[PDB]
């Protein structure tokens, strides 16, 4: 397990526990279940790259304490 952070709501940084082998799609779904957002059609962003759904966190070298963010932020927290 590793802890990562996501910036998808305007008022709040969410915290997730994930594994390097998790797919981007699964991670996004986990965020979506938690906060209602981002939609499946939106790609997450990490270090200037728009992440592809079928790759894993490890494919992108996403390690403990990384922060991902959404292209658009939902209002709230």
How would you describe the overall organization of this protein?
It is classed as signaling protein/inhibitor. The entry lists the keywords USP7, cytoplasmic, SIGNALING PROTEIN-Inhibitor complex. It forms a monomeric assembly. U7Ub7 Disulfide variant. The structure is a monomer. The protein is α+β, with helices and mostly antiparallel strands and 77 residues long. It has one domain: Phosphatidylinositol 3-kinase Catalytic Subunit, Chain A, domain 1 (Ubiquitin-like (UB roll)). It has 1 helix and 5 strands. It has one helix at 24-35, and strands spanning 2-9, 12-18, 45-46, 49-50, 67-74. The protein has a 3-stranded mixed sheet, covered by helices on one side. A two-stranded antiparallel sheet has the order 3-4. A hairpin with a 2-residue loop joins strand 3 and strand 4.
Beta content? 35-45%
Radius of gyration from the alpha-carbon trace, in angstroms: 11 Å
Could you tell me the number of beta strands? 5
- Reported CATH architecture: Roll
Q: What level of helicity do the residues show?
A: 10-25%
Note the main sheet. 3 strands, mixed
Global outline: globular
CATH topology, by name, is: Ubiquitin-like (UB roll)
CATH class: Alpha Beta
How many H/I helical runs?
Answer: 1
What order do the SSEs take from the amino end to the carboxyl end, as H and E?
A: EEHEEE
Q: What's the arrangement of strands in the largest beta sheet?
A: 2-1-5
Q: Structurally, how many domains make up the residues?
A: 1
How widely separated are the two ends? Answer: 25 Å
Estimated structural class: alpha+beta
What name goes with the CATH superfamily?
A: Phosphatidylinositol 3-kinase Catalytic Subunit, Chain A, domain 1
Family: Belongs to the ubiquitin family.
Subcellular location: Cytoplasm; Mitochondrion outer membrane; Nucleus
